[PDB]
Design a protein around this ligand. Structure first.
Ligand SMILES: [Cl-]
Ligand SMILES: [Cl-]
Ligand SMILES: [Cl-]
Ligand SMILES: [Cl-]
Ligand SMILES: [Cl-]
Ligand SMILES: [Cl-]
Ligand SMILES: [Cl-]
Ligand SMILES: [Cl-]
Ligand SMILES: [Cl-]
Ligand SMILES: [Cl-]
Ligand code: NA
Lengths: 396, 399
């Protein structure tokens, strides 16, 4: 009759559970049925308290047992795929990552579902699956495909079929089989270049021993203030190249709300000086010339949508972002009183970062800018990697 | 009683035909090396393919009894040379495969296909071969290190069966037991394509048609035609417009400048894993013993003959290469007058290259170096992928 699959997306920010449903397969489509966002941080934050993982995953796991008919449960696969937050934790300590993942398996296995495993998926998988999700939901697997742009807290992915495929960096190519049609995508995940790790890089780059424990920052609203722990700041492999001895344990970010100085400061965490290829993105990584249209999703959509709702070209988006950046923090909280301050306080930075990333990192300048479509859902399913992952895992 | 099978290994530098024979008990009966380059060099000369295969195939018709020829299967497995041609042109590659098939089909055996095998296949199968020959299949297994003209493979069973990159993993059952094997092929990092990458990286508009190169002996010259250099996908990333149609490499023989120049074709700056090989590719921690074969053996075998005929530490292997690299080209030819110049000319480069790939590439640093066994034959049969390929494509590997 109908079948069910559960995918946990363990990202650096949140874990999200997805329930998928599809007609029982017949010789004569998968859709998202329900989503749950686990309360709390990403699972790597449990590294020293894996005793709490089970409790952590319980509310959303219960949703799933309440939601899928009991008969149907034993035959429903459950998989957790973790992404860059967990790649970072593994770079830090293989053994912590493993203890996290083992605690997740023991938790999940304790449910009525068919445990298919808890893995840290690769950056190429993450990007390829995202491209699969969006082209599947756009009907493209029945011609040319849409490229895929994914932004999260800890990494960002770009995936697309390029005009001419090369040996230039064949660890950036992925070939796979989809409905008799075989595809070669370019795909790269830029670890540390998700929006949250990019901000840590920027703060570590810019903090001065000089400063009395203050960092004025043009990427935050005039009057915004936030205290940062230096041990948290340097607690990620992403800021290792910037570690300094600071004579303080903690510092206050003080916003100065200036978009073009923000833009300039962001560009400093990008390195454009070495490119052992025809052309590159940044940090000497190969990128072929852009080709076709793109779907941009996850944080790309949640951040751009917020600016669009304030208003749609590159010039127009730059202008809206510059104006918003310079609004004082009290005004911003008062104009958007329903928005969690943890997201609201970031929109100036994230918006300027997305613009820098797309326009300077990937060269979606001018004419190409219209080739990007920001997307949350297609036919009611989240754009993301999980859907494509479920199609694959479904042997589909 | 007695059965035969033939497998042609169409590699970038040579096609090698192998006859296997059997009632760990399958055995190489004979090998024939085909005179000429690899089959992809025939892209525009496909009518010549039949004449090219003639001598080795006439050999097999003479060797196998006619009583047994019709039931003897014959396979061509082509590797990274043809992967590169399929990239340049799928049309070319397929024309070569078609000319090869027509020709093999004309012989009195059981024709079973000519195809380009994958890098994983090539790896896994080399690992099968050495462990089947070693009888490690009756315990620990050996890792497999393969170098040819166009690619290089590393295959072994890691301590952790849960790999960080499972597109680098295969799981099978062989002779009662489960294995998870890590395997990876690095296209363009065979010894000949590495040389082209390096020369393409190093030639400058400034060069004025002369490239002084430390990886070649003082007094050595070699002419490189720019549109042939730039006719491999492996050099595309270094292409530049040059105001000369060719250039002359002039040897300066300095090992340590050779080494540095070599390091420059490998990208080692980002690694999202615990550890990588190079270019962001995951590599598990090395474990156990390794057999290093094909071009690893022929090059290293040359150098160990200067080392009291034993592979010494990396220190001494290095010292040996350093000294060898300085010898003028007339002296080196005078000292090894029985070695074909086309091999001898490449040894300083190839030895320096192999040391870098093993030590910095595959992280064989220090302690781990001594676990590499350079081998050509085990028990009279070549170490390579072709015996393993045969064992499976004749399904003679039991679960
Ligand atoms: Cl995480
Ligand atoms: Cl992320
Ligand atoms: Cl993060
Ligand atoms: Cl290109
Ligand atoms: Cl609001
Ligand atoms: Cl070839
Ligand atoms: Cl090869
Ligand atoms: Cl070659
Ligand atoms: Cl000389
Ligand atoms: Cl000699
Ligand atoms: Na390495």
């Amino acid at each position: 009759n109908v079948k069910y699959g559960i995918v946990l997306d363990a990202g650096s920010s949140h874990t999200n559970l997805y329930i998928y449903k599809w007609p029982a397969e017949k010789e004569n489509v998968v859709q998202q049925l329900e989503e749950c966002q686990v309360k709390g941080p990403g699972i790597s934050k449990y590294a020293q308290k894996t005793d709490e993982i089970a409790a952590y995953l319980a509310e959303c796991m219960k949703m799933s047992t309440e939601r899928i008919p009991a008969s149907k449960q034993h035959q429903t696969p459950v998989y957790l795929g973790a992404t860059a937050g967990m790649r970072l934790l593994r770079m830090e300590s293989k053994q912590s990552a493993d203890e996290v993942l083992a605690a997740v398996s023991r938790s999940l296995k304790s449910y009525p579902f068919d445990f298919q495993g808890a893995k840290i998926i690769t950056g190429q998988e993450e990007g390829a699956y995202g491209w699969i999700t969006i082209n599947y939901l756009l009907g493209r697997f029945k011609g040319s495909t849409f490229g895929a742009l994914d932004l999260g807290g800890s990494s960002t992915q770009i995936t697309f079929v390029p005009l001419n495929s090369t040996l230039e960096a064949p660890e950036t190519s992925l070939q796979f089989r989809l409905y008799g049609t075989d595809y070669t995508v370019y795909t790269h995940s830029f670890l540390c270049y998700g929006k949250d790790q990019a901000l840590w890089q920027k703060l570590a780059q810019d903090i001065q021993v000089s400063s009395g424990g203050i960092l004025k920052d043009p990427c935050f609203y005039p009057g915004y203030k936030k205290v940062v722990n230096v041990s948290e700041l340097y607690g990620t492999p992403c800021t290792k190249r910037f570690e300094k001895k600071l004579p303080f344990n903690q510092f206050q970010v003080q916003g100065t709300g200036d978009y073009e100085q923000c833009h300039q400061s962001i560009l400093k965490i990008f390195n454009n000086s070495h490119c052992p290829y025809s052309q590159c993105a940044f940090n000497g990584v190969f990128l072929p010339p852009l080709q076709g249209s793109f779907g941009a999703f996850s944080a790309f959509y949640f951040v751009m949508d917020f600016f669009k709702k304030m208003a749609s070209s590159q010039e127009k988006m730059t202008e809206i972002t510059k104006n918003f950046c310079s609004k004082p923090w009290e005004e911003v909280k008062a104009s958007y009183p329903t928005v969690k301050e943890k997201y609201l306080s970031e929109y100036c930075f994230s918006g300027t970062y997305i613009l820098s990333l797309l326009l300077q990192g990937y060269n979606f300048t001018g004419t190409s800018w219209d080739q990007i479509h920001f997307m949350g859902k297609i036919k009611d399913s989240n754009a993301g990697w999980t859907l494509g992952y479920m199609l694959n895992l479904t042997n589909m």
